[model samples]
Target: QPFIVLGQEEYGEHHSSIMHCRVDCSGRRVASLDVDGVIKVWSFNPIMQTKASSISKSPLLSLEWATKRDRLLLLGSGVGTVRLYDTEAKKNLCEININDNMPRILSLACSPNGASFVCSAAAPSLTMNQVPGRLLLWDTKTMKQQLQFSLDPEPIAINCTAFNHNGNLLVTGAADGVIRLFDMQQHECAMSWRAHYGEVYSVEFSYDENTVYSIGEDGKFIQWNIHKSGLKVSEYSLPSDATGPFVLSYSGYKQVQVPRGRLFAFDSEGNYMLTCSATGGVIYKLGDEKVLESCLSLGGHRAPVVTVDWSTAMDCGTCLTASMDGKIKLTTLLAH
Candidate 1:
């Protein structure tokens, strides 16, 4: 297989860091948020070319497009604020602030039907005598909290979350390397397991909705057995033709260590999986763990790559990726 570098765009406002990036369900629009609360939405043509751009303001930690119609965009900030934008009107329609109810918003996802959305928050502090992670379901039409679920008793922080295509299942990954699957209709956690050895930075449902794929600080690509209670269905190791495992070091507060928060994405069909590292992105077939097809270099970002997303708008196997080096690139997979 072969892949082509479709296009690249640098958001002028923030070239130092990109917080998040996502493709709308239709694949026609791509949205990205920076660390300084700046967001840029890209309108693209079917060939993966940028057509237009729109700007919005929010101190956002995460964001997602609310529906396939691409009319509404949902954003979440650090202080438990959720903002909804009407893309058609080019204005923010509502801002719901619930700082007291949920302290810090870590992740957000919208249901397929546009009825409700989900948000995950950090755990309560040690000083509060109780440490608990939170996941809340919100009514999109009413803009109100509909239901809430508590995570582990240890106050493990939720790093990422995603809802399945049918809106019936939700998967959350936390700092303690635990991944929990929730059945929306049952209103309870259906299953939980230790996914990675460290923090799980990303979790998403496969296009078929039969598997959950996740990547974390440990530099592992995992496919969970959703049909059989979220077991380790398969693991993708270094490809046979690859030189080595995709890994990197993080220099932090008191120590320099290798973190497991690498990001990955899958095409709309779930036929291909893309995993990224400090080196770049690797594309692999769902069950072909032993081979690597295309490797994306992201124009050679010097910093560690952190975010990757697939576009569903076109069903043409296009992907968008951003790095700490402050650059984003669009690429499309092609048959040789």
Candidate 2:
């Protein structure tokens, strides 16, 4: 084991099923949420841990790192609650619910400058007008609600969300298998079109921010071109009457290795990509040119990987993968 271990925890790692993990902006610490709503923080090394731990009342679903304030963590819960936790001082600085009575907040993504974040929520069912799903933009620094868009027409789950490098645009993937582009500058959703068959698990902007990539629940990976022409291109699959400030197309899609996976994360540069399989996480040098880099190069967990993240504090060569086997291992592509 040429274990290129840059940082080591004092012991093995988390003893529970880790649902989400995020490396802080400083690249010196990590925060994770487990099934029980427990939040824990660890420095780069194991024995160097701070005994920093906190738990939430509702089972937390996801968490994200505040881009500027690296020590403040944004936590989302099963009951549509979001909290701003201060990991450095071990204090709860802020708490708010996404809705008066709502479904779980499935995921969260902070803007590039850390000014705001989009809270992606689930749709429990529906009342005549009680749509539960939401794509909420929140002001992190001011604790203000920038804007909120009900994922309406009938409640549908917003399974994933991603903001472009400029933070002026957002892309969301949902249970309806539709992809939507939200213009934060204009506070309007300009384009949405059918992209996949089932739930699109992850959606992200390409490095150049000219393209969008989505991975579905069935393991389908498709790339779309951001066509601002407002006209549907021929041969592209789209919902009937799809028109907005933008049009999307699977314009550059080609045969890629991954056809099915659960969750995924791309490194900072968007050069390397990692996707979760039923058994473990796989890394690929999949930028404009998709290539397989490694598949469980070292012996990894056998049980399905629950959550994965690219290391921010550590060098880009490493990644953080939390598995069902109760371990959050720091994996690397540089070492054997």
Candidate 3:
């Protein structure tokens, strides 16, 4: 089989890093953010295509689409700030500061129903000795804070969070290697468990919303049955072969370390997963195996791949990846 490089763009200014990349449900718009807080909204075209952009003035840490229409970009910053921007209108409709003292707003996730979104922030860098994390729910329409949940008994930095397709369930991953599932209606964590040996970096809901998928700095991937209350249905460890789809290259040699801030994205249909590591993007199909194996690897980034997002417009072969190398690649898979 052959690989296709649909498009590529060099991002960052003066050694800045790309923090996140995402595509809207319409598959017609793409958004990316950098460590320098430069946010760009692209038209999803293959060429040099940036429709709108602006410098956020605060270190942008995370990004998410507040709706399916590609109308607005929800951004989170290092100073515990969140903003909603109208790309077309070129304006920020809402800006909310959760806590001026917090060090960073690590993750933001919009509810599937378009009613609200969630934001997670950690206490100042000085408080990293323990879990000083807070998760807040916001109303998308009013742009007001609706509810807040401060992690207790073990306050760890919440690294990632996700809302299910139905908007009833929420999941969060923390620096202490624990995963908590929350009920949106009840505004409380329904269950919590240790999910990995190291920091859990990402969590997402399955297509059917019956299960959850998670990945961590320890290189372990897990799938949980939410209905059964955090039951592990399957688990997979990143391969150490140093020569295949799951292998990672950290220093020009096949080596392993808890990968630096990484994220995964699922295809529109949820039939496939696109994940990034120190090596590159690897695609894995969902199955019943004890260890879900990767089926394809897109090894283009010379540095650690930080974030990935897949588009549904293609026939199961197109996705986007942003890396520490300060570049975003639009890639496509092909059959030989």
TM-score of each: 0.81, 0.79, 0.84
The residue pairs that clash in candidate 2, if any, are: 8-46, 9-46, 10-46, 10-47, 27-313, 219-259, 219-260, 219-261
Per-residue C-alpha lDDT of model 3 across residues 214-323, encoded as one tens digit per residue = 88756777888878865898888865322112333445776322322336777666877887755667888885676676777877777667677777565534577776
Best model number under TM-score:
3
> How many clashes (backbone N, Cα, C below 3 Å) per candidate?
8, 8, 2
lDDT of every model, 2 decimals? 0.66, 0.64, 0.72
Candidate 1 per-residue C-alpha lDDT over 1-336 given as tens digits, one digit per residue, 9 for 90 to 100: 345554554433345456677777666677777666667766656333343344444456678788755767888776678888776676789888864555667778888888888887764445521235678888887999987886765656677878887888889988788898888888888888889876777788877777888876565677888867657777765432121122233465331222222267766567766765554556666755354445444444555556677664433666665666556666665433
Candidate 3 matches the true fold with a TM-score of 0.84
Which residue window of length 10 is worst by lDDT in model 1? 253-262
Native-referenced Cα lDDT, model 1: 0.66
How far residue 28's Cα lies from its native spot in candidate 1, in Å, is 1.5
Q: On residues 172-213, what C-alpha lDDT tens digit does candidate 2 reach at each position?
A: 887777888888888888788877766666788878776787
> Candidate 2: lDDT over CA atoms?
0.64
